[PDB]
Design an enzyme around this catalytic site. Sequence first.
Site, PDB file in Angstrom:
ATOM      1  N   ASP A   1      -4.866 -16.162  -2.777  1.00 15.05           N
ATOM      2  CA  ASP A   1      -5.684 -16.797  -3.874  1.00 15.05           C
ATOM      3  C   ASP A   1      -6.264 -15.570  -4.576  1.00 15.05           C
ATOM      4  O   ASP A   1      -7.761 -15.481  -4.586  1.00 15.05           O
ATOM      5  CB  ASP A   1      -6.504 -17.738  -3.173  1.00 15.05           C
ATOM      6  CG  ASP A   1      -5.942 -19.142  -2.869  1.00 15.05           C
ATOM      7  OD1 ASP A   1      -4.721 -19.169  -3.102  1.00 15.05           O
ATOM      8  OD2 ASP A   1      -6.608 -20.049  -2.871  1.00 15.05           O
TER       9      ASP A   1
ATOM     10  N   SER B   1      -0.183 -29.125  -8.450  1.00 15.28           N
ATOM     11  CA  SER B   1       0.069 -29.912  -7.294  1.00 15.28           C
ATOM     12  C   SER B   1       0.666 -29.094  -6.264  1.00 15.28           C
ATOM     13  O   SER B   1       1.759 -28.308  -6.575  1.00 15.28           O
ATOM     14  CB  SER B   1       0.675 -31.299  -7.771  1.00 15.28           C
ATOM     15  OG  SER B   1       0.113 -31.797  -8.688  1.00 15.28           O
ATOM     16  N   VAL B   2       0.661 -29.432  -4.980  1.00 17.88           N
ATOM     17  CA  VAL B   2       1.190 -28.499  -3.782  1.00 17.88           C
ATOM     18  C   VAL B   2       1.836 -29.673  -2.810  1.00 17.88           C
ATOM     19  O   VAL B   2       1.219 -30.648  -2.465  1.00 17.88           O
ATOM     20  CB  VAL B   2       0.304 -27.423  -3.283  1.00 17.88           C
ATOM     21  CG1 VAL B   2       1.073 -26.940  -1.988  1.00 17.88           C
ATOM     22  CG2 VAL B   2      -0.282 -26.757  -4.203  1.00 17.88           C
TER      23      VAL B   2
ATOM     24  N   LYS C   1       4.611 -25.367  -4.765  1.00 20.73           N
ATOM     25  CA  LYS C   1       3.479 -25.372  -6.066  1.00 20.73           C
ATOM     26  C   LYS C   1       4.248 -25.611  -7.416  1.00 20.73           C
ATOM     27  O   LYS C   1       4.899 -24.841  -7.871  1.00 20.73           O
ATOM     28  CB  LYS C   1       2.576 -24.639  -6.035  1.00 20.73           C
ATOM     29  CG  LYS C   1       1.348 -24.843  -7.375  1.00 20.73           C
ATOM     30  CD  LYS C   1       0.040 -23.856  -7.364  1.00 20.73           C
ATOM     31  CE  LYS C   1       0.371 -22.406  -7.835  1.00 20.73           C
ATOM     32  NZ  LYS C   1      -0.690 -21.606  -8.100  1.00 20.73           N
TER      33      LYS C   1
ATOM     34  N   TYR D   1      -4.705 -26.123 -11.278  1.00 19.53           N
ATOM     35  CA  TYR D   1      -3.787 -25.108 -11.428  1.00 19.53           C
ATOM     36  C   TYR D   1      -2.495 -25.753 -10.995  1.00 19.53           C
ATOM     37  O   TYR D   1      -1.528 -25.223 -11.741  1.00 19.53           O
ATOM     38  CB  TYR D   1      -3.992 -23.872 -10.090  1.00 19.53           C
TER      39      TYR D   1
ATOM     40  N   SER E   1      -3.920 -30.924  -4.664  1.00 18.70           N
ATOM     41  CA  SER E   1      -3.949 -30.940  -6.264  1.00 18.70           C
ATOM     42  C   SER E   1      -5.172 -30.589  -6.738  1.00 18.70           C
ATOM     43  O   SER E   1      -6.305 -31.013  -6.788  1.00 18.70           O
ATOM     44  CB  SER E   1      -3.237 -32.051  -6.560  1.00 18.70           C
ATOM     45  OG  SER E   1      -3.810 -33.257  -5.913  1.00 18.70           O
TER      46      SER E   1
HETATM   47  C1  LIG Z   1      -0.884 -15.107  -7.656  1.00 14.84           C
HETATM   48  C2  LIG Z   1      -2.198 -15.785  -7.554  1.00 14.84           C
HETATM   49  S1  LIG Z   1      -2.727 -16.788  -6.370  1.00 14.84           S
HETATM   50  O1  LIG Z   1      -2.436 -16.058  -5.203  1.00 14.84           O
HETATM   51  O2  LIG Z   1      -3.793 -17.305  -6.751  1.00 14.84           O
HETATM   52  N1  LIG Z   1      -1.455 -18.034  -6.146  1.00 14.84           N
HETATM   53  C3  LIG Z   1      -1.758 -19.439  -5.488  1.00 14.84           C
HETATM   54  C4  LIG Z   1      -0.802 -20.074  -4.975  1.00 14.84           C
HETATM   55  C5  LIG Z   1      -1.340 -21.138  -4.310  1.00 14.84           C
HETATM   56  C6  LIG Z   1      -0.555 -22.361  -3.814  1.00 14.84           C
HETATM   57  C7  LIG Z   1       0.780 -21.987  -3.717  1.00 14.84           C
HETATM   58  C8  LIG Z   1       1.447 -20.984  -4.500  1.00 14.84           C
HETATM   59  C9  LIG Z   1       0.608 -20.003  -4.967  1.00 14.84           C
HETATM   60  O3  LIG Z   1       2.574 -20.729  -4.354  1.00 14.84           O
HETATM   61  C10 LIG Z   1       2.995 -22.002  -3.623  1.00 14.84           C
HETATM   62  O4  LIG Z   1       1.989 -22.632  -3.081  1.00 14.84           O
HETATM   63 MG   LIG Z   2      -8.810 -20.288  -2.134  1.00 18.43          MG
END
Ligand SMILES: CCS(=O)(=O)NCc1ccc2c(c1)OCO2
Ligand SMILES: [Mg+2]
Length: 348
Positions: free
Chosen positions: A164, A33-34, A49, A31, A28
């Site tokens: 990311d 929690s995962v 997420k 942005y 977490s």
């Molecule tokens: C498109 C901008 S990004 O690449 O920063 N998105 C990060 C992200 C991080 C964890 C996640 C996710 C997306 O979806 C499920 O778990």
């Molecule tokens: Mg990263």
Amino acid sequence: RPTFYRQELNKTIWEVPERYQNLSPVGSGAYGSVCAAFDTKTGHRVAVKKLSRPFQSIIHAKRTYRELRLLKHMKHENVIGLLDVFTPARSLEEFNDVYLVTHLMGADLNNIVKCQKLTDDHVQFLIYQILRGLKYIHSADIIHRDLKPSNLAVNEDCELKILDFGLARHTDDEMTGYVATRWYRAPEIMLNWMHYNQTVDIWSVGCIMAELLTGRTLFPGTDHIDQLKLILRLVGTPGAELLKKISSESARNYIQSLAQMPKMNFANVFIGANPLAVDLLEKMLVLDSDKRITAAQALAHAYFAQYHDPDDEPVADPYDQSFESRDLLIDEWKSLTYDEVISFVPPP
Ligand SMILES: CCS(=O)(=O)NCc1ccc2c(c1)OCO2
Ligand SMILES: [Mg+2]
Ligand SMILES: [Cl-]
Ligand SMILES: [Cl-]
Ligand SMILES: [Cl-]
Ligand SMILES: [Cl-]
Ligand SMILES: [Cl-]
């Protein structure tokens, strides 16, 4: 509409479709929690997420929209893509929560550069895949802005994905001092010299390739000024042609205060490396961003002769980013995001 079920995991309510089973917290940030989960429709292990406070301000609502547009667009073997997006809301009026789903990533490049012996063949294949992904990203007029080893997922077969994307997120505190968050950044963006473009990502690929060859960080500066001194000692101080392109007068004055240094011999820095690897590093790590090699040009370099296939290096569909200059209310950004959730079509 699927059926949803609710559960509380580490102080957070998760409401998800029945297809997603065995959820377990994995991290977490600010942005969201995962959780890791098993997807019964696809048979894949997935990351789910739950965004935190997606519509709390105009800035946050626009960031939510940007992230969802970018993830829906990216369809390439060497770039993270979107498996699913969902909300438990049955109308715009009750819409508050957004959930994103991707493939679950195992190791990053940090967990193979630290703890493994890499052949030149491994360095060729890993850097080939980053440049194949970047050719695709750059063809859509997208800049990554944050390439570094922790943003590169790698599996047992040495297959790589970029993730990311920088969504304009990083703070002043996060870039201060002895930190990996600044070690891979191009000097023109680290010190705000000028309007930057997609060339900043090729500088980052240089820093990553050097570290795969030596096992050590190329420019581990203790602060912005220490890091600039490490950079200029390798590539040399700027000439009059680059100095004219620096828009800050004070940045120009500071550069001119430093004693002039020539570019070093990279064969005496990267001792024992493949001469073709040395040649490609000299073409990436160029101070003047106008003169750096592009991702498309680098794929045709003789270092990658073993892997290069000009009929299997695809470009992206056109990407409309006109929303970025648009001035809207919270509820207008929220309505745009709702429409992008409900129109999502899963991949094959
Ligand atoms: C498109 C901008 S990004 O690449 O920063 N998105 C990060 C992200 C991080 C964890 C996640 C996710 C997306 O979806 C499920 O778990
Ligand atoms: Mg990263
Ligand atoms: Cl379901
Ligand atoms: Cl993917
Ligand atoms: Cl909701
Ligand atoms: Cl990193
Ligand atoms: Cl578009």
